[PDB]
Amino acid sequence: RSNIIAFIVPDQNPFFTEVLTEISHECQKHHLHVAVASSEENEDKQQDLIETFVSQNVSAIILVPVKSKFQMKREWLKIPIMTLDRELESTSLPSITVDNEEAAYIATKRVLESTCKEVGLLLANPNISTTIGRKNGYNKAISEFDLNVNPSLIHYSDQQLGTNAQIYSGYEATKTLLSKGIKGIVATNHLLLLGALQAIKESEKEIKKDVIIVGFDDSYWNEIYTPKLTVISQPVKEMGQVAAKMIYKLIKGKDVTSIKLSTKLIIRESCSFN
Amino acid sequence: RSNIIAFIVPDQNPFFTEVLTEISHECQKHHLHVAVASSEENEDKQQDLIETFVSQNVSAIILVPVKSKFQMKREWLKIPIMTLDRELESTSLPSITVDNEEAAYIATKRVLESTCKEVGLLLANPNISTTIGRKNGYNKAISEFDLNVNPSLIHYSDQQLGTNAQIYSGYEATKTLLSKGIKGIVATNHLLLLGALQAIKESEKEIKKDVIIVGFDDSYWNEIYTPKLTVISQPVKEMGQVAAKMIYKLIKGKDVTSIKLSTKLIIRESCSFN
Ligand SMILES: [Cl-]
Ligand SMILES: [Cl-]
């Protein structure tokens, strides 16, 4: 076997690179190197990447599926494989994920606990399990406040594929939301968040005054943004540590069960009105 | 010989993932896929990764060397190899780079156009060719304004290794520079810039009032930060496309010559006093 573990990502969300770094630190312990290849949300590219890594006989694959409706060819299954972040629609393939519903529930509830009772939602593609999880968290919070869901308020990145696609979706969605006088926004990944912030910046409107916002995925830049950004923070170190341990046991042929972790909200400045 | 191109990067500066996306887009026209692995500025790690990709018979390696003093093992010479971003001391390896002297020259001059006559410089490790080039450009601008080079105004990320090490170096240096009343700063990469912005935020001091700053490296943070960040922009699109062309020519056993590109200063808000 090659001493490479192939980490197949869907996009350039720093989230994946931060998890990578953790996986990598732990794996070099057993003289395993991690290599990363991005599918850019293209499914044909994802298939080409798996097929190359199988052919190369890598030690293992960690797949972040571009869509949840996807089957592993019988010919690939000789390689230890697990998924991360997202689940596939029907496998006994072990995964590592967070509680996506809780996460978006916490985030949505926080915006509601201000004056804002009509919350814009920015979602990625609904073919992804994390999108469905996050949509369900939003719905649950809305309902707890005895509000009606307004499908008008929910936007998806379902037009194009990849990193920049997601950013533009957040931007254009937010630009629309702001134009309707929406005052509260939950952006459910780092890139959708960056697009939201682009639209808000470009407009006249002032965070904490005209609009409030909760994002997902932390960065050192959230603490130095004006105003500081409240986000759902994912447990990236722990996820990386656990995935590295899950992947080692798979490489040794031991039984492994799926793990789900917990996010936490980091309250800063952007989620409350002055 | 597998259809994989290995891109070995020194840290998690978005500069490298941005170039990667461009390299990937072009190379996949030829059914070749780019996989990334980071040495995190560790030369042992770099060597391991090279040894690993050589053993797996990758089509090619694009190396971003952690340091200038590097020699190929003769066993490695069967696999086509170029360097990107950085040049080696003595080798036959083709490179693709920018004009680093001109980049830091333009940036320092921009700061010197203000009242400010003492300019802090944040640099990476001096054992990197881009660091030396950027230092030379700063010296040039200082001299052209008939000021003398003051070594105490220049900081280096050479105490620790990797991404966080460079952010922290940028933070500790800026804090020191601000403690001395320095009103003008050039941060010569995105990581040092981030560290600088942290230090500035922690201090009482306000950009455009108490201090001005010019950074390096395009980022989506730049247009949306408060104030908007002036930076030297690197031509990541051209760089990635041209490197993909170079590496393909190499894979085909054709002669390739080294390329040097030009950066450009994007003037926004952070580089002038109000
Ligand atoms: Cl869930
Ligand atoms: Cl140069």
Coordinates of C-alpha atoms in Angstrom, one line a residue, chain A residues 10-218:
Chain A
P10 CA -15.9 19.3 -2.3
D11 CA -14.7 22.9 -2.1
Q12 CA -12.2 25.5 -0.5
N13 CA -14.1 26.0 2.8
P14 CA -11.3 26.7 5.3
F15 CA -13.3 24.3 7.5
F16 CA -11.9 21.3 5.4
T17 CA -8.3 22.6 5.5
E18 CA -8.5 23.1 9.2
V19 CA -9.8 19.5 9.7
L20 CA -7.1 18.4 7.3
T21 CA -4.3 19.9 9.4
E22 CA -5.5 18.1 12.5
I23 CA -5.9 14.7 10.7
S24 CA -2.5 15.3 9.2
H25 CA -0.8 16.0 12.6
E26 CA -2.1 12.8 14.0
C27 CA -1.5 10.6 11.0
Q28 CA 2.1 11.4 10.6
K29 CA 2.5 9.5 13.9
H30 CA 2.0 6.2 11.9
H31 CA 4.0 7.6 9.0
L32 CA 0.8 8.3 7.0
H33 CA 0.6 11.4 4.8
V34 CA -2.6 13.1 3.9
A35 CA -3.2 14.4 0.4
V36 CA -6.1 16.5 -0.5
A37 CA -7.9 16.8 -3.9
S38 CA -11.0 18.9 -4.5
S39 CA -14.0 17.8 -6.6
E40 CA -15.3 21.5 -6.7
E41 CA -18.8 20.0 -6.2
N42 CA -18.5 18.2 -9.5
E43 CA -19.5 14.6 -9.4
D44 CA -17.6 13.3 -12.4
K45 CA -14.5 14.8 -10.9
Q46 CA -15.3 13.1 -7.7
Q47 CA -15.5 9.8 -9.5
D48 CA -12.2 10.4 -11.3
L49 CA -10.5 11.1 -8.0
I50 CA -11.8 8.0 -6.2
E51 CA -10.8 5.9 -9.3
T52 CA -7.3 7.3 -9.3
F53 CA -6.8 6.8 -5.6
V54 CA -8.1 3.2 -5.8
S55 CA -5.7 2.5 -8.7
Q56 CA -2.8 4.0 -6.7
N57 CA -3.7 1.7 -3.8
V58 CA -3.7 4.5 -1.2
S59 CA -3.9 3.4 2.5
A60 CA -7.4 5.0 2.9
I61 CA -9.9 7.5 1.5
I62 CA -11.8 10.1 3.4
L63 CA -14.6 11.3 1.2
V64 CA -16.7 14.5 1.5
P65 CA -19.5 13.5 -0.9
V66 CA -20.6 16.2 -3.4
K67 CA -24.2 14.9 -3.1
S68 CA -25.7 12.4 -0.7
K69 CA -27.3 10.3 -3.4
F70 CA -24.2 8.5 -4.5
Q71 CA -23.2 4.8 -4.6
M72 CA -19.7 3.4 -4.2
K73 CA -18.7 1.1 -7.0
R74 CA -18.1 -2.5 -5.8
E75 CA -14.6 -2.2 -7.4
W76 CA -13.6 0.6 -5.0
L77 CA -14.6 -1.1 -1.7
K78 CA -11.3 -2.8 -1.2
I79 CA -9.9 0.6 0.0
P80 CA -10.7 1.7 3.6
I81 CA -13.1 4.5 3.2
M82 CA -15.1 6.7 5.6
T83 CA -17.1 9.9 5.0
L84 CA -16.6 13.2 6.8
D85 CA -19.1 16.1 7.3
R86 CA -21.7 14.5 5.0
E87 CA -23.5 11.2 4.9
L88 CA -24.4 9.1 1.9
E89 CA -28.0 8.2 1.4
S90 CA -27.6 4.4 1.9
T91 CA -24.3 2.9 3.1
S92 CA -22.9 1.2 6.1
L93 CA -19.8 3.4 5.6
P94 CA -18.8 5.0 8.8
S95 CA -19.0 8.8 9.1
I96 CA -17.9 11.7 11.2
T97 CA -20.4 14.6 11.3
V98 CA -21.9 17.2 13.7
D99 CA -25.5 17.7 14.9
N100 CA -26.5 19.9 12.0
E101 CA -30.1 20.4 13.3
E102 CA -29.0 21.5 16.8
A103 CA -26.4 23.9 15.1
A104 CA -28.9 25.7 12.9
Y105 CA -31.5 25.6 15.7
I106 CA -29.1 27.4 18.1
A107 CA -28.2 29.9 15.4
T108 CA -31.8 30.6 14.3
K109 CA -33.0 30.8 17.9
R110 CA -30.3 33.5 18.6
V111 CA -31.5 35.8 15.8
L112 CA -35.1 35.2 17.0
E113 CA -34.3 36.2 20.6
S114 CA -33.7 39.8 19.2
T115 CA -36.6 41.8 17.7
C116 CA -36.3 39.8 14.4
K117 CA -39.0 37.4 13.7
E118 CA -38.5 37.1 9.9
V119 CA -35.1 35.4 9.5
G120 CA -33.5 35.0 6.0
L121 CA -31.8 31.6 5.6
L122 CA -28.8 30.9 3.3
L123 CA -28.4 27.2 2.5
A124 CA -26.0 25.4 0.2
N125 CA -27.3 22.7 -2.2
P126 CA -30.2 20.7 -0.8
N127 CA -28.7 17.4 -2.1
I128 CA -26.2 17.7 0.8
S129 CA -27.1 16.1 4.1
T130 CA -25.7 19.1 6.0
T131 CA -28.1 21.5 4.1
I132 CA -31.1 19.3 5.1
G133 CA -29.8 19.1 8.7
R134 CA -29.5 22.9 8.8
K135 CA -32.8 23.5 7.2
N136 CA -34.4 21.2 9.8
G137 CA -32.7 23.2 12.7
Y138 CA -34.1 26.5 11.3
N139 CA -37.6 25.1 10.9
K140 CA -37.5 23.7 14.5
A141 CA -36.6 27.2 15.9
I142 CA -39.2 29.0 13.8
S143 CA -41.8 26.6 15.1
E144 CA -40.8 26.9 18.7
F145 CA -41.5 30.6 18.4
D146 CA -45.0 29.8 16.9
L147 CA -44.0 31.4 13.6
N148 CA -44.9 30.1 10.1
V149 CA -42.2 29.1 7.7
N150 CA -41.9 31.4 4.7
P151 CA -40.2 29.6 1.8
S152 CA -39.5 33.0 0.3
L153 CA -36.9 33.5 3.1
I154 CA -34.9 30.4 2.4
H155 CA -32.3 30.5 -0.3
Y156 CA -30.1 27.7 -1.8
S157 CA -26.9 27.5 -3.7
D158 CA -28.3 25.2 -6.4
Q159 CA -27.4 27.1 -9.5
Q160 CA -23.7 26.4 -9.8
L161 CA -20.8 24.3 -8.4
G162 CA -17.8 25.0 -6.2
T163 CA -16.3 27.6 -3.9
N164 CA -17.0 30.9 -5.8
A165 CA -20.5 29.5 -6.7
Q166 CA -21.4 29.4 -3.0
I167 CA -20.1 32.9 -2.3
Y168 CA -22.1 34.4 -5.2
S169 CA -25.2 32.6 -4.0
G170 CA -24.9 34.1 -0.5
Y171 CA -24.2 37.5 -2.0
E172 CA -27.1 37.5 -4.4
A173 CA -29.5 35.9 -1.9
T174 CA -28.6 38.5 0.8
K175 CA -28.9 41.4 -1.7
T176 CA -32.5 40.2 -2.4
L177 CA -33.3 39.7 1.3
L178 CA -31.9 43.2 2.2
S179 CA -34.1 44.7 -0.6
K180 CA -37.2 43.2 1.0
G181 CA -36.2 44.8 4.4
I182 CA -35.1 41.6 6.0
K183 CA -33.3 42.3 9.3
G184 CA -32.0 38.9 10.4
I185 CA -29.8 36.4 8.5
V186 CA -28.5 32.9 9.2
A187 CA -25.7 32.0 6.8
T188 CA -25.0 28.3 7.1
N189 CA -21.5 28.0 5.9
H190 CA -18.3 30.1 5.7
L191 CA -18.6 30.9 2.0
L192 CA -22.4 31.8 2.2
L193 CA -21.4 34.0 5.1
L194 CA -18.7 35.7 3.0
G195 CA -21.3 36.3 0.3
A196 CA -23.7 37.7 2.9
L197 CA -21.0 40.1 4.2
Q198 CA -20.2 41.3 0.6
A199 CA -23.9 42.1 0.0
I200 CA -24.2 44.0 3.3
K201 CA -21.0 45.9 2.8
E202 CA -22.0 46.9 -0.7
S203 CA -25.4 48.1 0.4
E204 CA -25.7 51.2 2.7
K205 CA -26.9 49.0 5.6
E206 CA -25.2 48.8 9.0
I207 CA -24.9 45.6 11.0
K208 CA -26.3 45.8 14.6
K209 CA -28.5 48.6 13.3
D210 CA -30.3 47.7 10.0
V211 CA -29.5 43.9 10.1
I212 CA -28.1 41.2 12.3
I213 CA -26.3 38.0 11.3
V214 CA -25.2 34.6 12.5
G215 CA -22.7 32.6 10.4
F216 CA -21.2 29.1 10.5
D217 CA -17.5 28.1 10.5
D218 CA -15.1 30.2 12.6

